[PDB]
């Protein structure tokens, strides 16, 4: 019942990542660990506290102590970046409880700055009685970015939709942010700008109507 993991873990290569998974008294319970790389399916990595399935690297080893069970990935490699879930069989409700998940981030890539191009609404989009702003972010690392919009230079919180970051052809992340508007506000405010904060670093682009 309620298996609990820390959300994020960062370990540079060579070190050993010890992803912890805590349930109330896991006293040698059937602890099982699963790696879930992006886009694909969970694959069993460690079962029965510490044992492995055949074909799983010798690096992976588990340990289930008293009240907290942990996963030891000795000599971490870049190909070990994934989400890791723990799981036991709860006899109280006869259920199969999974952990909260832990995104393991292998480092080994210097911090990168976004490129935050802006697009006004189209001359044909206004002909269609609408106006949507486009914010496109690419070529930035630490997969975490905060977005905030500004009309003219007055704060805004209405009509903005933003997607979650995604790995590129590069191993740098990318995300998109949109803003639907009304056409009379578009040419009343002098300029629209993209304000994108990444790790505490803000880059902006500006445009004026036609």
């Amino acid at each position: 019942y309620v298996l609990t993991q820390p959300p994020s873990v960062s370990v540079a290569p060579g070190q050993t990542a010890r992803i912890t998974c805590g349930g109330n008294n896991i006293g040698s319970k059937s602890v099982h660990w699963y790696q879930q790389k992006p886009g694909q399916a969970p694959v069993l990595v460690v079962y029965d506290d510490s044992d492995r399935p055949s074909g799983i690297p010798e690096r992976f080893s588990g340990s289930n102590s008293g009240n907290t069970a942990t996963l030891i990935i000795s000599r971490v490699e870049a190909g070990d970046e994934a989400d890791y879930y723990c799981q036991v069989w709860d006899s109280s409700s006869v259920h199969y409880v999974f952990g909260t998940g832990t995104k393991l981030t292998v480092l080994g890539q210097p911090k990168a700055a976004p490129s935050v191009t802006l697009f006004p609404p189209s001359s044909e989009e206004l002909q269609a009685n609408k106006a949507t702003l486009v914010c496109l972010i690419s070529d930035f690392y630490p997969g975490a970015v905060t977005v905030a919009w500004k009309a003219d230079s007055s704060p805004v919180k209405a009509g903005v939709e933003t997607t979650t970051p995604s790995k590129q052809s590069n191993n740098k992340y990318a995300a998109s942010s949109y803003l639907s508007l009304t056409p009379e506000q578009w040419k009343s405010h002098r300029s629209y700008s993209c304000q994108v904060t990444h790790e505490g670093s803000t880059v902006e682009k500006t445009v004026a109507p036609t």
């Binding site: 059937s30 099982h32 699963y34 879930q36 694909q40 399916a41 969970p42 694959v43 069993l44 079962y47 029965d48 044992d51 399935p53 989400d83 879930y85 799981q87 069989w89 409700s93 006869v94 259920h95 199969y96 409880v97 999974f98 952990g99 909260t100 998940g101 191009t117 697009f119 006004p120 609404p121 189209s122 001359s123 044909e124 989009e125 269609a128 609408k130 949507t132 486009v134 496109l136 690419s138 939709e161 933003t162 997607t163 979650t164 995604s166 590129q168 990318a174 995300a175 998109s176 949109y178 639907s180 445009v207 036609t210």
Partner: protein, 222 residues
């Protein structure tokens, strides 16, 4: 190797039902029983239930209790998964997974998953508006142009520039899901601005489920 292959992605509307198959390959199917797992977007694994290929009895989780139906077919070596009273919060990837009687207790073999987008929107084709580059840029450097693929509710829309000849600078961003249950994405190419009138830039926004084939040129701002 013993494989688990699942049905393809399904698109349902709230209040319906959805069946997802998960075929086992090879051995006497009714050897070791298998279970099902939900995983909503971005979130974590959730256990849904069990069926025994042999003794077709089932055992579910409390959240999906009564609204999930699990069946198996001994002849074709498969298991089935039915959600009843489909709700919008059930949009997820639904995995299947077998546990082998003996070694041990975890699911050694997993399925590929089946995305089940669940929303009330109707199958619609997107409207395209060209996005003009930097107005001046006469003596500037490099600029970005693009196409706006607005408003559609199936999420395989494919954009390609000039029948695929344009490759350098292309970055088609993942689509956004606006609050109305409808999608929108953008595709942008970065090119030197010295050619702002001597090569042609046309994007082909294809949307197969509505067979909406629309071309849209991006000329410099005017």
């Amino acid at each position: 190797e013993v494989q688990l292959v699942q049905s393809g992605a399904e698109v349902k509307k709230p209040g319906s039902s959805v069946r997802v198959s998960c075929k086992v390959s090879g051995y006497t199917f009714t050897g070791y029983y298998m279970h099902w797992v939900r995983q909503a977007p971005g979130q974590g694994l959730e256990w849904m239930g069990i069926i025994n290929p042999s003794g077709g009895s089932t055992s579910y989780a409390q959240k999906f209790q009564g609204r999930v139906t699990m069946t198996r077919d001994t002849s074709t070596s498969t298991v089935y998964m039915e959600l009843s009273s489909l709700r919008s919060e059930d949009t997820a990837v639904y995995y299947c997974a077998t546990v082998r009687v003996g070694a041990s207790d975890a699911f050694d073999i997993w399925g590929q998953g089946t995305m089940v987008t669940v929303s009330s929107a109707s199958t619609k084709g997107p409207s395209v508006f060209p996005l003009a580059p930097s107005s001046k840029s006469t003596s500037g450097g490099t600029a970005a142009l693009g196409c706006l693929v607005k408003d559609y509710f199936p999420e395989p829309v494919t954009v390609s520039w000039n029948s695929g000849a344009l490759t350098s600078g292309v970055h088609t961003f993942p689509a956004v899901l606006q609050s109305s249950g409808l999608y929108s994405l953008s595709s942008v190419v970065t090119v030197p601005s010295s050619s702002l009138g001597t090569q042609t830039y046309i994007c082909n926004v294809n949307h197969k489920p509505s067979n909406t084939k629309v071309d849209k040129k991006v000329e410099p701002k005017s």
